[PDB]
Automatic annotation (TrEMBL):
Alphabetical list of Pfam families matching this protein: DUF4962, Hepar_II_III_C
Stretches assigned to the Heparinase II/III-like C-terminal domain: 494-708
Keywords, alphabetical: Signal
UniProt lineage: Bacteria, Pseudomonadati, Bacteroidota, Bacteroidia, Bacteroidales
Protein name, as recorded: Heparinase II/III-like protein
Cellular compartment(s): Cell envelope
UniProt GO cellular component terms: cell envelope
Domain Heparinase II N-terminal: 8-481
GO terms assigned for molecular function: lyase activity
Zinc-finger listed as a keyword: no
Keyword field contains Glycoprotein: no
Top-level division of the source organism's lineage: Bacteria
């Protein structure tokens, strides 16, 4: 019942295998064919500093697909400049064969092995139309992207009485005759010039220049939309005036990073499509010159690269959408746009939206918000020009649950990904996204999230958030769809939700009444610690009433700086385990996974396995980033030869009590000192010996409490510190002044080859007193629960938890159960019994 994984990595930075996988049942009809490039290409390793990059040849691929193993009876064939193919027809049931070829410059075909896949009677069908169908009916008039000319007068009439629409005209009006200076006079480079490390210097320059470009983009976009809503040409004149100034910044030594360049493409698209029928010859040539120039640059970056990266953050967040809209703005007018529409349309269908198909966001809490406009505007646009519902992708209904569970109403986010610590309460962008899901998917949980939050805070959509990647005001001005009626309440959600492919879990005692909610979050993820994710496999965080207590420490000062690598991404910042003080590898190789779980009512359960996540850093991407950044992946900083053989963490939610039981199995290749970590981020912990173990009291500055009752199969010593491994220096000046210190508890065992830990965590606020832990009859009882477990380094692990009066039980053992976890639960008066075994993700 217990699976051992022996892969060096579960997910690849650069695609290494074909999809659909050999011998699999496909998840959708038609399958989405993808394969590794003939010349696999990592590409530039940072935004400001590319590092060592290889050639990226242009290539041609072919593909053949058939139920005839010898590829003569009824064969689907295609040729592409890129390693993905969409058949654009549902395939017949049965077994299928296929292969792909690389075609050399000389015309020779290099054919792959012949792969197999199967289609069932049950296989779901999601079959968007060919691009040829879409372009055939696509109108030649403008506007056609920001809105359609045939609907223009209707959109104007509808918004005459839309108070949200007034903001465009008010913001745009303040720009008129209010000149914009050149970039060198507007930018602040005073911090930039103090930085000697080139990764830091260029990253600071990107931030400082984006401040100005993003400010003025908001002005230009308001001018375009104000013109569209009023047809007052004063907005056209100032729109062209301002955009012309920004475009002249193009070749400035201060115009840094790819978002700034994509912003020029975006604004040129908006002005070209929206002002089209007013443009002078010179104005039209200016916009078209820059669409041609910058669209070609981005297409050339993407092709033979983007489609096979695990995920390419800036592209997924913003620049892909910007290329797509520039392409459809100009298709049939400039020849380059035919290739771009082909690429963008097929790449979206091939593998977007999202990476994890369970709906969770791979890069964590803050990164999700930078994707909001891409996740809605691209399928809204594709759907209206196609007549086909691109929101039928099941990812969206899945992601609706991620939106709610990862950050409940008025609550701190679950604590994953870069800048997690700043995500303190759902912002207007998140509510605007949930609103779009409610309308486009008729999703009642998304609708309940919007309505229950807007009842407490009716002005939430106008509160502060970064508007550039997330503001859906224009979607709300243009959609014909209404908010669905409030039906479901958030209180009708299951207490717990597990994202098996994302590798996360959220447990809640009262998700529908946030101020009373005791919450625990957990991560053990096949994505590992690359990109914006952290090295926090098998880490948990706790919350009460929407404010954290036990919580991942450190500050997001950058992407690769020493504080990030040693004290924020690093495993030592998290509520997990170190091995002789050493932590998890940085990259996809530092992966975890969730082998088994159970979402119930009187009891829920999740397990994380991080057995392979420790050791030396070997990721080529992160070794190159480290070389450029000054990182030392050495034992002194926390990475050494792997000693870890087995690390499973069992997390049991004890119904709605606010109690959680965390039980750890650990095995090493030799005797090692195990370090058990807890952190808080507002107040120090208070530690006393309690029976044969330790009591660790964490509290926040509000009502929140979390008490760890920690026991181990070996003797422990402990210490607490107020300082990070290395100072949280805000060299970028990207954070507020203060940057409080955090607090770090470490329990270290005597050296041993095996150890077990039991941690009973009591999470509450002013709703009740501390729970009393009774040590009786050689087990432990609290509030009617009875907890037995193995705390013998020489004996077999087991965990038995039962509440006889609630009718709940959990039994994990290697004897009766052969490694399985058996569950008994009560749901709607009915006895539920489950036997849980491992499954891969
Ligand atoms: O609290 C927040 O910080 C925050 C909350 C919001 O939800 C979110 O919208 C906002 O995102 C912005 C960041 O705050 C901002 N940080 S800043 O310091 O630059 O002002 C920035 O973050 C980007 C950056 O491009 C970069 O930031 S940082 O250097 O880590 O400080 C970094 O980008 C990586 C990138 O992820 C990598 N992609 S890859 O796929 O892994 O290869 C690759 O491109 O390298 C760069 C770093 O290169 S370099 O070192 O700079 O040369 O992280 C990005 C990010 O976190 O999104 O921009 C975001 C979004 O801008 S917004 O305001 O329009 O939303 O964050
Ligand atoms: Ca992202
Ligand atoms: Ca993370």
């Amino acid at each position: 019942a217990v699976i051992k994984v022996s892969e060096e990595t579960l997910m690849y930075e650069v695609r290494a295998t074909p999809s659909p996988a050999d011998g699999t049942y496909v998840k959708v009809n038609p399958p989405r064919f993808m394969w590794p490039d003939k010349f696999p290409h990592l590409g530039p390793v940072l935004d400001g500093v590319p590092g060592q990059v290889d050639e990226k040849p242009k290539v041609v691929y072919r593909i053949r697909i058939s139920q005839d193993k010898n590829f003569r009876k009824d064969v689907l064939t295609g040729e592409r400049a890129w390693a993905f193919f969409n058949p654009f027809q549902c395939l017949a049931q049965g077994k299928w064969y296929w292969q792909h070829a690389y075609v050399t410059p000389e015309g020779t075909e290099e054919w792959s092995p012949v792969y197999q896949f199967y289609i069932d009677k049950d296989t779901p069908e999601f079959n968007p139309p060919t691009l040829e169908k879409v372009l055939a009916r696509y109108p030649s008039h403008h506007p056609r992207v920001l809105l359609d000319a045939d609907d223009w007068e209707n959109i104007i009439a509808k918004n005459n009485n839309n108070p949200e629409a007034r903001t465009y005209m008010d913001k745009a009006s303040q720009c008129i005759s209010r000149p914009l200076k050149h970039l060198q006079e507007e930018i602040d480079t005073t911090n930039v010039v103090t930085l000697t490390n080139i990764v830091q210097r260029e990253s600071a320059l990107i931030r400082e220049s984006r401040k100005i470009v993003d400010r003025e983009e908001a002005n230009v976009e308001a001018l375009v939309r104000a013109y569209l809503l009023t047809k007052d040409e004063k907005y056209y004149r100032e729109g062209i005036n301002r955009l012309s100034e920004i475009l002249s910044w193009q070749k400035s030594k201060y115009f840094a990073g790819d978002f700034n360049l994509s912003t020029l493409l975006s604004m040129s698209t908006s002005a070209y499509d929206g002002f089209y029928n007013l443009l002078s010859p010179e104005e039209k040539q200016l916009l078209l010159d820059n669409i041609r120039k910058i669209g070609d640059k981005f297409y050339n970056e993407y092709v033979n690269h983007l489609e096979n990266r695990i995920a390419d953050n800036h592209v997924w967040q913003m620049t892909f959408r910007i290329l797509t809209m520039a392409a459809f703005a100009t298709v049939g007018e400039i020849p380059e746009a035919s290739v771009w529409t082909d690429y963008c349309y097929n790449e979206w269908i091939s593998r977007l939206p999202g990476l994890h198909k369970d709906g969770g966001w791979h890069n964590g809490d803050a990164a999700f918000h930078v994707n909001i406009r891409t996740l809605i505007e691209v399928p809204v646009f594709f759907s209206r020009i196609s007549g086909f519902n691109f929101f039928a992708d099941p990812w969206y209904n899945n992601n609706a649950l991620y939106v709610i569970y990862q950050q409940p109403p008025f609550s701190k986010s679950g604590g994953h990904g870069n800048s997690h610590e700043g995500q303190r309460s759902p912002n207007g962008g998140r509510i605007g996204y949930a609103d779009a899901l409610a309308r486009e998917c008729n999703n009642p949980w998304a609708a309940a999230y919007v309505h229950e939050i807007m009842q407490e805070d009716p002005d939430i959509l106008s509160k502060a958030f970064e508007a550039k990647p997330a503001d859906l005001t224009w979607y709300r001005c243009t959609t014909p769809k209404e908010r669905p009626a409030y039906s479901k309440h958030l209180s009708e959600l299951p207490e717990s939700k597990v994202f098996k492919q994302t590798g996360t879990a959220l447990m809640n005692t009262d998700i529908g009444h946030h101020a009373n909610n005791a919450m625990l979050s957990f991560r053990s993820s096949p994505y590992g610690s690359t990109s914006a994710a952290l090295a926090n496999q098998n880490a948990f965080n706790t919350f009460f009433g929407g404010k954290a207590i036990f919580y991942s420490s450190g500050h997001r000062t950058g992407f690769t700086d020493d504080h990030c690598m040693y004290a924020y991404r690093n495993t030592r910042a998290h509520n997990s385990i170190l091995v002789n003080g050493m932590g998890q590898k940085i990259g996809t190789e530092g992966y975890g996974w969730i082998p088994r779980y159970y979402e119930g009512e009187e009891i829920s359960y999740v397990v994380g396995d991080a057995s392979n996540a420790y050791g030396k850093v070997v990721s080529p991407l992160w070794l190159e980033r480290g070389r450029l950044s000054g990182t030392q992946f050495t034992p002194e900083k926390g990475w050494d030869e792997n000693k870890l053989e087995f690390f499973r963490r069992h997390v049991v939610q004890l119904g709605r009590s606010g109690l959680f039981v965390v039980y750890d199995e650990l095995a090493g290749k030799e005797p090692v000192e195990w370090n058990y970590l807890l952190h808080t981020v507002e107040l120090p912990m208070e530690v006393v010996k309690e029976e044969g173990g330790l009591r660790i009291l964490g509290k926040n500055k509000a009502d929140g409490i979390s008490i760890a009752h920690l026991y181990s199969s070996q003797e422990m010593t402990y210490a607490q510190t107020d300082t990070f491994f290395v100072a949280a220096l805000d060299w970028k000046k990207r954070l507020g002044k203060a940057l409080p210190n955090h607090y770090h508890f470490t329990a270290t065992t005597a050296p041993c080859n095996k150890v077990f830990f039991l941690n009973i965590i009591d999470v509450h606020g002013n709703n009740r007193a501390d729970a009393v832990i009774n040590h009786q009859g050689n087990h432990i009882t609290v509030e009617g629960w009875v907890i037995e477990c193995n705390l013998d380094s020489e004996g077999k692990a087991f965990l038995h938890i039962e509440n006889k009066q609630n009718g709940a039980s959990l039994d994990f053992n290697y004897n009766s159960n052969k490694g399985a976890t058996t569950i008994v639960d009560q749901v709607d008066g009915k006895r539920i019994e489950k036997r849980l075994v491992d499954s891969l993700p």
